[PDB]
Design a protein around this nucleic acid. Sequence first.
DNA 1: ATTCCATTCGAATCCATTCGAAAATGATTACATTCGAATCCATTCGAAGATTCCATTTGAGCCTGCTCGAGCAGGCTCAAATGGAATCTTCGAATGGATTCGAATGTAATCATTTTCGAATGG
DNA 2: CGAATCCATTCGAAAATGATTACATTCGAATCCATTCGAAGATTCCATTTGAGCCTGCTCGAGCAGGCTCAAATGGAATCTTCGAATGGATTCGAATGTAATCATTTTCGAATGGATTCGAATGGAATCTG
Lengths: 102, 95, 80, 77, 91, 91, 89, 96
Amino acid sequence: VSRSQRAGLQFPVGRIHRHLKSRTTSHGRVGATAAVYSAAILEYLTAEVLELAGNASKDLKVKRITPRHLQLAIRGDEELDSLIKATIAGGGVIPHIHKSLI
Amino acid sequence: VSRSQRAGLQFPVGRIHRHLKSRTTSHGRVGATAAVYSAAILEYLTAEVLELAGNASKDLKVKRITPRHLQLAIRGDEELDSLIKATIAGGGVIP
Amino acid sequence: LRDNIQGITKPAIRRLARRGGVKRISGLIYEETRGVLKVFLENVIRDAVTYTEHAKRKTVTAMDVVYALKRQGRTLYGFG
Amino acid sequence: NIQGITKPAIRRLARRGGVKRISGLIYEETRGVLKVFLENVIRDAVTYTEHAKRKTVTAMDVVYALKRQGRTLYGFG
Amino acid sequence: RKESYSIYVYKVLKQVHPDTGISSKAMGIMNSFVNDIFERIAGEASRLAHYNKRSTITSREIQTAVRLLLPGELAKHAVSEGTKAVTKYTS
Amino acid sequence: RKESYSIYVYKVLKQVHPDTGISSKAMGIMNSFVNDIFERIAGEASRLAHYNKRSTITSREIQTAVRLLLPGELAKHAVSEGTKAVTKYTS
Amino acid sequence: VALREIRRYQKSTELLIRKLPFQRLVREIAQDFKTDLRFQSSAVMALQEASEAYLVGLFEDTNLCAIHAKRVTIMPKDIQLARRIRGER
Amino acid sequence: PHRYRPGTVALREIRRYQKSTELLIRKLPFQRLVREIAQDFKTDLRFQSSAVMALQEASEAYLVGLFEDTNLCAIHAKRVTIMPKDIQLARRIRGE
DNA sequence: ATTCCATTCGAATCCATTCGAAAATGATTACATTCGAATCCATTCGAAGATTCCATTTGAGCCTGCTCGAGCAGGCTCAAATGGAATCTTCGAATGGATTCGAATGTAATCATTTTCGAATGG
DNA sequence: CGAATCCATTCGAAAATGATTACATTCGAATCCATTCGAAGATTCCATTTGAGCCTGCTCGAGCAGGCTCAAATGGAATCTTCGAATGGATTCGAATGTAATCATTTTCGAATGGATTCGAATGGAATCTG
């Protein structure tokens, strides 16, 4: 009868509630339905990134995910590239050669 | 005797203490000298900017201060330009 | 309201370019300038309308625009 | 010790960047740029270390300094 | 003791790709990504609550923060998922 | 009623230039500048306090926040001023 | 005469786009997000100031790019390169 | 005496170094440089290995991005050779 | 005809997924009380018209300065081969500084009065 | 000349004093990792010279596209008028969150190994520079 099972998620709801209640300045209350929204958002984004990375890995005939596949999946999608502007340690760069150099 | 008078300042110490207390997450305490430090820093920065703008106004033979003077003073100094990158409504451009 | 982007005439673009420090201007600059202005305005107005809608209002105030500008990284002094 | 970043290393970085031909005065410019960047980051890393009353520079000070500069890094914490 | 998001990331991965594995460094990158996104959303929600002179954080603040932070065609799906989850939780 | 930093800015201006006035628009500019700087310092101090697992904000946090944000010589000068005030307060 | 205009328009501080056309354009753009909206004069003024500052900075960078390629005439190539290096698109 | 015309091996190394994911600067010289630079802020410091590795990763990413911008600027002026003026223009436009 | 490289077979090597033990920590029940909806009413305030001088914009023509394409010569970066430094790997004591656990203090938040001050309105 | 800046004033909203508690931070020890230091060796990167051809900078002729001048008309400014649309403040109430005990999960840390993943060959499939 956990709250995540009631909502139908995998990410926790009690822990997210506890984390939200510690960053609300002074005398700030947190409703019980903000945690459900936050957990759903995080799960959706995680599923999107993992799906793209798994497709990129399967394109190369391997059975595991590495930071190279994460970088390849992220940089190939416009929305994910716009949202994530951080440095992935171990990804390299996407191959691309200018037309006038060949 | 006000706390500002004890510290020798013009900016308020009680008001800044109250403002700082409304930013601490959950059960967060604030000291008594944090307000004094913050007031001193704010007063110093304000005095520097006002001094530069007044010098520019004296250069331009105007008794008053306008946003043009503020823009001229801010963009003419390396560190003030580095710190302040906002847009001043009524300044124009530097030749 | 239709084709209101053509009210940003050629002289206005010429004046902005002159203040920028430009000596000669090509004849195809105006369409590019209109496009970039449209994109900028669309982003900022979208954020301002979101801020207005959250507060259950029907009027767009100056503070919504100030917050929307600060979100992008274009802080503006003198309006709020 | 800035001469330990050799010319072939700069050539390899340029190749990964996509450069086909390189001039002869690029290397000193690259060395100066790298020195400036490193100084800027290490200043804040050491400030973060000193605030905590420590003598060892950890990976989290570097991560925090990079996030402050606007160069977030994923993988070290 | 120390807490992380590894269990749930592995659960989601086994949900979407039932025959593909993950490594340790990719796991660290995923943890960093989740923490960063959570911090962004929480900060925006706190600011939104402060602007209107409120004290309580609700699902309206989270929805507005998601709309302000995420790029288009990602805000719609995220808002739909959150609304569905809240509606199921309440009933 | 609303609060503002007009009186203190006027006092400082009369301290530096005893014969110069200031208009309304410049006063608005200065108010915005002061609020911006205060919010920056407060946020950085809160982050510094959180990183070290502590709950109290002291003058050490303010000093380090000033060291991080202000560039070059400014920071040095600022620090001196602040320190002086504290020594005149406790005694 | 091209330098006289630069000297004249770099010293002033007023706005360079007419007010009524810009207000009409702002309303037409905002029509796509919500119908039956209202504005304040301060909102339109803030938008105009921000737009003018953005365009002036962009034109400065464009002039730099034009000078790099041994020219005095600015073309769309320079605008595209300036917006690409800034990471705007 | 087999020889390659100038410009082919360059493309070969471009492909080779864009396909991989490793680090391109050696480790000991970078460690020495980091220590020497940091000795000007506080005397008798100590470094975890992870700090040095994080610094190396950040530096390499920065340099690769800068070289991409430099190549764009060089192509603009109808050239294939990169020169210091391209670096200066790219850094000036980026805000640095 | 000479090199170079995606992709495919062995092989010891490495590592990701299971499996147990046990200590935080959610989830349920029962008060107490902040906190934010729900109606009513004042007043600013933004929108739609009407009426002009006058400044600003827009074609139309002219022509000169600026950009572009082609043939040349010289500056200079690339490709290859030979010595020769110095990074990388592995091993092992010697040493320094984070980190946890008790006690003894330093200090900041919470009521109850009293009083000083700054924000709005005129002039 | 007039549109703006500066000074007088009464009152509520807020800051300063004085006790009182607890709460958080300071001051020794005691491990125990984890960073600095020293030594030896095979080899793989790096530094220097020679030969040479491709890219870069400069001159000349030709076209082309942008700036400058003038006359006519147009659309933005500027000053009331009406009004009806929308904020903003008071006063109940009703919905909802925090706090305190008591379990019973649930997640974290320390070993075990069968499989996906590096070196070492390998000859097929191009790529290339010279004819």
